[PDB]
């Protein structure tokens, strides 16, 4: 299969809560890049109490002899996604991602 798109895996640091200030304090982020195959599932419109929002989904496929690094969310084309399904048939990997919003 044709693999030309770029995918970046991001892992967040350790977190702990500080009771005096009342804020969460976090560490640094580690980013690793890779080139895989991605396809689009379409953007749908949903109605919520506060209004209307749009969310998109994407699928990432991988051939063997590739190891997936530990990660939390994935950045594909300036947007952050977080996985929903993970299937590993016969030394292969297939993932289904769905869009979320991450603090600046």
């Amino acid at each position: 299969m044709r693999c030309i798109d770029e995918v970046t895996f991001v892992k967040k640091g350790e977190r702990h809560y500080d009771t005096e200030k009342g804020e969460w304090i976090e560490g640094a982020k580690t980013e690793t890049v890779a080139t895989l195959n991605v396809t689009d599932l379409g953007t749908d419109r949903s109605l919520v109490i506060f209004g209307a929002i749009t969310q998109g989904a994407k699928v990432v496929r991988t051939l063997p002899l590739f190891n997936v690094p530990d990660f939390d969310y994935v950045i594909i084309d300036g947007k952050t996604y977080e996985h929903l399904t993970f299937r590993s048939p016969l030394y292969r990997n297939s993932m289904i991602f769905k869009e979320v919003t991450i603090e600046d």
Binding site: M1, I4, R61, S94
Partner: protein, 114 residues
């Protein structure tokens, strides 16, 4: 040297894969028409078959990780492949083979009077 070539092709980055594909396609195209290393006009014959190497390299980049498979499916992505890459190039290979056999004093389609 097949081990490192296969490993780089399957897990390397884009440029290494393209270089390996170029070299292997060049070797295959040289082997098909029966070229010999002793021929004086090696460079001209190499430069004459550039388009075939072009197209076959383009096909083989798409056929990466799927060698000798009629079909493939992974979550709604279904692909099908033909029998071989060099099926279209038949008459051209035949003509080049005849010309090189004539040039190199070969036994292909030549009448010998003993």
């Amino acid at each position: 040297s097949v081990l490192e070539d296969v490993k780089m092709l399957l897990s390397g980055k884009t440029d290494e894969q393209l270089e390996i594909i170029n070299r292997r396609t060049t070797e295959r195209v040289v082997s098909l028409i029966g070229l010999e290393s002793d021929n004086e006009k090696y460079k001209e014959v190499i430069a004459a078959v550039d388009t075939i190497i072009y197209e076959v390299s383009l096909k083989r980049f798409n056929r990466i990780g799927n060698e000798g498979m009629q079909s493939y499916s992974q979550e709604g992505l279904s692909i099908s492949f033909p029998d071989s890459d060099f099926d279209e190039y038949k008459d051209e290979i035949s003509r080049w083979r005849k010309k090189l056999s004539d040039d190199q004093k070969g036994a292909f389609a030549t009448v010998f009077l003993l």
